[PDB]
Design a protein around this ligand. Structure first.
Ligand code: HEM
Ligand code: HEM
Ligand SMILES: [Co+2]
Ligand SMILES: [Co+2]
Lengths: 147, 147
């Protein structure tokens, strides 16, 4: 269709605006991306621990990025960063009272968000749409289908 | 799905790259957007004429933009800009030999492009996909469904 790139970008920009507004309403700002992922990981596996190294592996990111991410999670009060008692070179992450509230709020938000967004759309229609995208991606990438 | 905005943007960026590479191969660079639209309009209605004012109305753009667009079409050698003989305040646009070659090349390109992109996708699947997008747009816009 005419002006393919402008129309697609106008839609994603709209969606970004929607998600940002919805997130603020549920007080789960900054949890839409990587912060959310790690908070929900901590919350759902309290048996286990997560070092900064574990964070890198879990999100497939470099040390420097992982380090920036966890420092900002701490800034936000979601986690405390405490070196290993046995070896003070390993940094372990622990969800705070606030990070735990944020976790239970984020789960609700994602449920309500999907209910709202996906109202009037079937599992079959999703499957169809997903296939058309995948086929489009495959037709216009060729040997570069490593994505 | 996780990282919704990053995944959508990575796909549109890919598509932009594809279209740019495909356009260069068919020598119809700069015709992907507004230039194409006006060249194909000129080519398909040689009976009629197109002023800069007609260009504004046809593309729903302001005078200043229309003026920048046609000056760049002239720079590219697709058109000649010649004031009305009767009234030298009306500017009329005329497709050149080159603009006409470009027009017949652009038509081929769009046919091949769609054949390639839409291979392995049915009219029903398009209709489905279109409905899911429209419903998504409607669910996440509400009163701002003026798009
Ligand atoms: C500059 C790029 C493009 C232009 C100018 C363009 C233009 C058009 C035009 C004019 C039509 C209508 C043709 C007709 O009247 O029969 C059309 C149809 C269509 N385009 Fe595009 N298009 C472009 C890129 C794309 C892309 C990237 C996609 C999808 C990846 C796409 C998907 C379609 C589809 C599905 C149709 C419907 C064809 C039909 O069944 O009639 N187009 N496009
Ligand atoms: C930050 C934003 C979002 C996050 C973190 C996110 C995350 C997720 C997650 C984790 C799932 C899997 C849930 C499960 O295991 O049951 C999921 C499913 C899904 N998401 Fe999202 N999502 C987001 C936004 C969106 C958006 C914007 C759309 C579409 C507009 C969307 C469409 C879907 C769909 C269709 C499913 C499939 C649900 C199913 O049938 O199991 N999501 N999302
Ligand atoms: Co310890
Ligand atoms: Co004249």
């Amino acid at each position: 269709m005419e002006n393919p790139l402008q129309k697609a970008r106008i839609l994603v920009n709209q969606l970004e605006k929607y998600l940002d507004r919805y997130a603020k309403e549920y007080d789960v700002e900054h949890l839409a991306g990587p912060q959310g992922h790690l908070v929900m990981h901590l919350y759902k596996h309290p048996d286990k621990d997560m070092s900064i190294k574990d964070a890198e592996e879990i999100l497939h990111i470099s040390k420097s990025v992982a380090s920036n991410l966890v420092k900002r999670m701490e800034k936000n009060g979601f986690i405390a960063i405490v070196p290993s008692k046995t070896d003070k070179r390993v940094k372990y992450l622990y969800l705070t009272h606030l990070g735990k509230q944020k976790a239970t709020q984020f789960e609700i938000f994602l449920e309500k968000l999907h209910s709202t967004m996906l109202a009037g759309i079937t599992k079959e229609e999703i499957r169809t749409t997903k296939k058309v995208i995948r086929t489009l991606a495959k037709n216009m990438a060729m040997e570069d289908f490593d994505s």
